[PDB]
Design a protein around this nucleic acid. Structure first.
Lengths: 330, 127, 542, 84, 150
DNA sequence: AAAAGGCCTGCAGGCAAGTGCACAAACAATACTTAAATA
DNA sequence: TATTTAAGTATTGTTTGTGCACTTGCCTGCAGGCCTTTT
């Protein structure tokens, strides 16, 4: 079974130990950071660019319908497949701000909230609302709810919260701060959810104060803005080359003999403790026997020779990319 | 005689909210390795923690003749406000975090009267 | 730059033309003003009901607050959104202290915050003192009037019970002052049985000396909910009617809510009126003055009515005439809303029946099953034939009604949020138009292809094997030919010359789709310093 | 082989009275801290025993059954249920 | 009547012979037979699904002859009445209105109306100006207006 | 053929390889009250 | 003599920590069952 509740209990069988695979990231080709961005920016502007632009023009006809819902106190909450950053900045500025300012007679200011950034505190967001409208934060909004009730219905501030599923927005301290502001009939709330557990954050007491309106707009956006906030490329192939470059001439010869001995039979377990001292007897590199601790404590700091005494050492690194390191050090 | 025989003590749930507490009691007092043989005393100890997707699978099976829309998640969010289901964090909880698990927080006597109002056999699953 | 920064601040009618783009401009302007008449009239009665809810709530609380123990008042079904106003009696100063679960982290901060509001309220009416229990004892020597503290515990279910138990015992020592009276107010949102097991034996017996119940939920006895549904029917009496499917969807949505179902009902009633004035072009014929504005396009729409097809079918079995037959058939008031008001006012006044809802009473009158609903009380047996009424199926009644059938009201307020993500990702042929044209028609997108292999897998998926499966589906000759179509970028032609070009492009698109799935909640990682195994957390269908 | 059998709603008061009398200690509980540093960090952290109801709290006996048989005379009727 | 019979053991050559009487190609005939194999169970009357699927594809394929001659629609209905041994004209209309709702969201039904997207783009986007399935289609009212004039 | 003497082999005695996951504390640095320079 | 905010106490928050839980590998411990004798 694949769909319905029968598919959940059928796809979670007890897999045997011998039936599992042992494929890691060693057989996969290694890529750098420069070539990762050149291909990403090329596929997001040419692959399926015509169907994406034609679908975006279809959703553009829903612009007057979205403005009709905000004038009645219904907050907007967009969702679907992909990011909605380019769809919110083009509607809440190039359509929502000129229409509101021309129907209640400068433009209407819009506060863009970065919900994808984990460093979005709850004291810096409320500082811009007071300066543009003119726990002390929760008590301040409660004093403005009853005050704005007698005021006429006129949108003065537009709240364009981006990514309503990040780590900063999902906190309970920030959620209740935005739901109390959504009750005001003079503030427009335009959010966008990306996680599949969006209605799980709000309950019955939060849905009545938010008054959100779902709008599916699966544009299949690659999300290039929010992708630059996490470690996408994530023991350091390019980082190990800069360590040996800053070291001395004699320090590079100690690591060259360890790589050639370890990569000789990848089924050799590695280089034993006394085995490394035998290499010095044929090549005058170190001083004596007590000087081994001066070079062993420095290699383990840069993550290049892990210990695994059953002293046999073995660094968790395959021989696919290790062969190219010998050419650079030579 | 009614003033000495006893101490005189001391002195409206939704349909979806009632069925959600029934499926949460099963996922917190039963192993998930044998769930493919029934829907396809452990109650005397502390309940176990489960996942969100593991709860919706049993809830959809025990529901009478429904996909997981926003109405199911709305009743599940309100079930945690009344302290009816415990989690792993008390203050500043993250519902979107994949490491935070959910567990039941109601006794057996409370979950017995709830299943009896919806005409659901809850005592046969643990017999 | 604004694209690389964190957060930055950037500082004639929406009604589109209908009639297949052939509607005149004079009909769109009057449609905006006609909608405002029903929108302002409905909100004027709703605002009066909301103001009346707090009016009776403030009077019922004050009647039980003032008419050596604690005056505990349990407010079952209160979301801590009511403003309690105390009286101004002479020779006695009343202070209302509101405690929130966020501002109460421990016991020391509970007494310090309660003493700050007490000293600030007593000084604003008519020397620095400590913020502790010494101010309550020395309240008569520093002011001369009595003390009557009214504690209002906001959100009792959201506060810790280990801290609330110590606050009640600490306030019990203020009973030996002979001039201090403490009255606690709890806003319970669950049940009275859940708040009893989380307290000690010395706390339950102490508060039971003078405790009273005051249940005031959003639908306490279906009293406040009947006034909201009646206000929506008075503004449409003789203009718009309700269908049998609209009342069913309302009862199915209000039953899910409990603590805030009144605001959810107004959202469904306002959304149904907005779609009628934007989609149905027959909204201009509601007013008795804008009836002569008829054309050839309006007569071709009313002829496709299911109820009108039955009237013309029986006449043959036994353009000038059609215009007079349509105008002279709308003057009837249609007693479909005034009859429900007479029944609701006959059981609550004469029969004294207040445990009834107007929403379920209106659904039985539309389908003709009013006798199957009034017999559940065993009281109006002799008045069964008096309140008997049958619905009259009038012609062209669907053009001026609020009926939900194509899933418009469903995919708006209560949609399938989880099912829409899995359906649009798997069945990508329904969203994308089936019109670099060779690659768009022979290769699936990265977002659509990743969800196909993710569903057809077990709970434990390996990233080393998932990349090989995704690379085997993409063609090799079409990928290399598409990346070489940009001669302006000199860095794109240098990467394609390498033999490992196809193995590097597929790995970049795979890493961009894996991280995009984790932000949405589709996959789940194991350890932090590992990144080798992924799990499943979203199942399509459930 | 008549003792009034008390209901489950009446043993709650007797259960809480034995805890204050130092007889039922919580399982894996530190209790009184040594210095004032550990006493402040323990008050801000909510334990798992406060969220769970009273009928599911793991407790421990301060006196085993072997010691109860020595401090109870033979005249009491509850002496036959202390041997096991 | 053949529509009143419940649980009928239909073979594989019965739907083929019934589709050849309405002049249908082999491309649209195999799609109707394949729809019955996947939906063998969860049904009340097998004749209601076969009759509702054949008549639904007749108006789409023969759409060029119904607009020129209004008598083609009135003739294709009386033919199915003799094969089903029925005399009520309301049973034929009630059968083609139930199977159409179940086939309104498939893949083979979309390509049949294109060769012989404008409505599905408003349901997924949540548009308030979508085509509601309440009123009669404009192409259906023009046929009934010409049937009562002959 | 069948109950009465010996003994064959299915079910599962038993625990340790290893990952799992709830526990507690100082951890990092939140928000806040404090004292002092200023016009 | 009181607005100016620096810097202060009091306090938040999430971080890794490790005590302790759990699974399932393995013959081998052991006992229902087969064989033999006999009217």
């Amino acid at each position: 079974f694949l769909d319905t509740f029968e598919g959940y209990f059928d796809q979670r069988k007890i897999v045997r130990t011998n039936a599992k695979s042992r494929h890691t990231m060693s057989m996969a080709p290694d890529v750098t950071r420069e070539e990762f961005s050149l291909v990403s920016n090329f596929f997001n502007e040419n692959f399926q660019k015509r169907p994406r632009q034609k679908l975006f023009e279809i959703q553009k006809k829903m612009f007057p319908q979205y403005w009709f819902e905000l004038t009645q106190g219904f907050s907007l909450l967009f969702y679907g497949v992909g990011s909605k950053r380019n769809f919110l900045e083009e509607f809440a500025i190039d359509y929502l701000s000129p229409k509101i300012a021309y129907s209640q007679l400068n433009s209407i200011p819009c506060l863009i909230l970065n919900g994808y950034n984990p460093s979005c505190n709850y004291r810096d967001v409320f500082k811009e609302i007071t300066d543009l409208l003119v726990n002390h934060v929760i008590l301040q909004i409660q004093k403005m709810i009853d005050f704005y009730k007698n005021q006429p219905l006129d949108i003065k501030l537009i709240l364009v919260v981006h990514n309503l599923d990040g780590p900063s927005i999902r906190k309970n301290t920030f959620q209740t701060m935005l739901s109390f502001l959504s009750v005001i009939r003079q503030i427009a709330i335009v959010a966008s959810t990306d996680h599949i557990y969006a209605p799980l954050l709000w309950d019955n007491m939060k849905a009545q104060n938010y008054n959100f309106v779902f709008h599916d707009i699966s544009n299949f956006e690659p999300s290039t803005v929010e992708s630059t906030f996490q470690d996408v490329m994530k023991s350091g192939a390019e980082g190990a080359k800069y360590v040996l470059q800053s070291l001395t001439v004699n320090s590079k010869k100690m690591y060259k003999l360890l790589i050639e001995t370890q990569m000789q039979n990848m089924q050799r377990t590695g280089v034993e403790l006394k085995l490394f001292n035998h290499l010095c007897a044929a090549d005058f590199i170190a001083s004596n026997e007590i000087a081994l601790r001066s070079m062993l404590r420095e290699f383990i700091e840069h993550k290049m020779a892990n210990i695994t005494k059953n002293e046999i050492i073995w660094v968790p690194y395959t021989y696919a990319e290790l062969e190219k390191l010998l050419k650079t050090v030579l | 005689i009614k003033l000495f025989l006893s101490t005189d003590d001391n002195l409206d749930l939704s349909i979806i909210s009632k069925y959600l507490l029934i499926a949460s009691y099963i996922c917190s007092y039963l192993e998930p390795r044998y769930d493919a043989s029934i829907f396809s005393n452990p109650r005397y100890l502390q309940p176990s923690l489960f996942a969100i997707e593991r709860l919706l699978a049993i809830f959809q099976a025990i529901f009478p003749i429904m996909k997981a829309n926003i109405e199911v998640f709305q009743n599940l969010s309100e079930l945690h406000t009344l302290k009816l289901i415990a989690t792993t964090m008390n203050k500043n909880i993250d519902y979107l975090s994949p490491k935070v698990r959910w567990k039941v927080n109601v006794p057996w006597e409370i979950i017995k009267e709830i299943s009896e109002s919806v005409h659901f056999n809850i005592s046969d699953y643990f017999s | 730059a604004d694209a690389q920064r964190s957060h930055y601040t950037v500082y004639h009618i929406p009604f589109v033309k209908l009639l297949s783009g052939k509607e005149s401009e004079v009909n769109v302007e009057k449609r905006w003003e006609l909608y405002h008449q029903l929108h302002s009239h409905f909100h004027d009665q709703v605002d009066h009901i909301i103001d009346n809810i707090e009016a009776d709530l403030k009077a019922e609380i004050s009647d039980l607050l003032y008419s050596r123990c604690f005056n505990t008042i349990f407010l079952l079904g209160s979301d801590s959104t009511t403003k309690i106003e105390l009286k101004d009696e002479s020779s006695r100063y009343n202070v209302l202290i509101e405690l929130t679960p966020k501002e109460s982290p421990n016991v020391r901060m509970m007494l310090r915050r309660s003493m700050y509001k007490l000293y600030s309220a007593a000084d604003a009416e008519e020397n620095d003192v400590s913020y502790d229990l010494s101010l309550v004892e020395n309240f008569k020597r520093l002011f001369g009037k009595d003390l009557a503290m009214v504690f209002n515990f906001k959100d009792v279910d959201s506060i810790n019970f280990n801290t609330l138990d110590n606050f009640i015992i600490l306030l019990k020592s203020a009973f030996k002052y002979d001039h201090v009276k403490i009255s606690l107010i709890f806003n319970i949102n669950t049940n009275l049985s859940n708040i009893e097991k989380n307290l000690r034996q010395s706390t339950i017996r102490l508060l039971k000396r003078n405790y009273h119940k005051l249940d005031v939920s959003s639908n306490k006895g279906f009293k406040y909910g009947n006034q909201i549904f009646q206000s929506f029917l008075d503004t449409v009496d003789g203009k718009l009617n309700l269908s049998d499917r609209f009342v069913e969807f309302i009862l199915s949505k209000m039953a899910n809510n409990t603590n805030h179902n009144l605001q959810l009902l107004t959202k469904m009633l306002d959304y149904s009126l907005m779609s009628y004035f934007f989609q149905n072009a027959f909204s201009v014929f509601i007013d008795p003055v804008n009836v002569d504005f008829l054309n050839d396009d309006y007569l071709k729409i009313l002829s496709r009515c299911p109820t009108f097809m039955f009237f013309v079918e029986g006449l043959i079995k036994q353009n000038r005439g059609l215009e007079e037959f349509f105008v002279e058939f709308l003057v009837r008031e249609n007693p479909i809303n005034g009859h429900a008001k007479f029944v609701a006012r006959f059981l609550e006044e004469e029969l004294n029946i207040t445990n009834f809802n107007l929403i379920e009473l209106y659904h039985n009158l539309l389908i003709g099953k009013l006798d199957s609903y009034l017999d559940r009380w065993s009281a109006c047996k002799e008045y069964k034939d008096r309140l008997h009424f049958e619905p009259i199926d009038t012609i062209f009644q669907e053009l001026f009604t609020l009926d939900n059938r194509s899933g418009l009201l469903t995919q708006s307020i209560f949609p399938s949020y989880k099912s829409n993500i899995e359906d649009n990702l798997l069945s990508w042929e329904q969203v994308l138009p089936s019109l670099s044209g060779d690659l768009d028609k022979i290769m699936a997108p990265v977002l659509g292809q990743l969800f196909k292999l993710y569903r057809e897998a077990n709970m434990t998926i390996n990233i080393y094997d998932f990349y090989i499966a995704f690379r085997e589906t993409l063609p090799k000759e079409e990928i290399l030919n598409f990346i070489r179509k940009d001669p302006s970028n000199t860095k794109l032609l240098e990467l394609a010359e390498t033999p490992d070009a196809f193995d590097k492009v597929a790995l970049i698109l795979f890493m961009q789709a894996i991280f995009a799935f984790e932000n949405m909640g589709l996959i789940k990682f194991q350890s932090t310093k590992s990144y080798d195994l992924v799990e499943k957390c979203v199942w399509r269908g459930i | 082989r008549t003792i009034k059998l008390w209901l489950k709603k009446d043993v709650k008061n007797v259960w809480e009275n034995l805890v204050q009398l130092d007889f039922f200690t919580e399982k894996s509980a530190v209790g009184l801290r040594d210095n004032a540093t550990a006493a402040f960090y323990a008050s801000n952290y909510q334990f798992q025993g406060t969220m769970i109801p009273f009928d599911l709290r793991s407790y421990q006996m301060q006196i085993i059954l072997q010691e109860l048989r020595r401090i109870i005379p033979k005249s009491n009727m509850y002496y036959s249920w202390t041997q096991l | 009547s053949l529509l009143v019979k419940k649980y009928c053991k239909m073979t594989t050559e019965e739907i083929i012979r019934l589709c050849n009487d309405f002049e249908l190609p082999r491309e649209v005939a195999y799609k109707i037979v394949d729809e019955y194999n996947i939906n063998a169970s969860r049904l009340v009357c097998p004749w209601q699904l076969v009759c509702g699927l054949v008549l639904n594809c007749t108006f789409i394929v023969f759409n060029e002859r119904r607009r020129k001659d209004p008598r083609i629609d009135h003739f294709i209905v009386s033919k199915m009445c003799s094969l089903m041994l029925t005399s009520k004209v309301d049973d034929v209309i009630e059968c083609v209105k139930l199977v159409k709702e179940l086939i309104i969201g498939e893949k083979w039904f979309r390509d049949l109306q294109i060769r012989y997207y404008d409505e599905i783009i408003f349901r997924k986007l949540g548009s308030m100006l979508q085509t509601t399935n309440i009123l009669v289609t404009d192409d259906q009212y023009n046929i009934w207006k010409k049937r009562i004039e002959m």
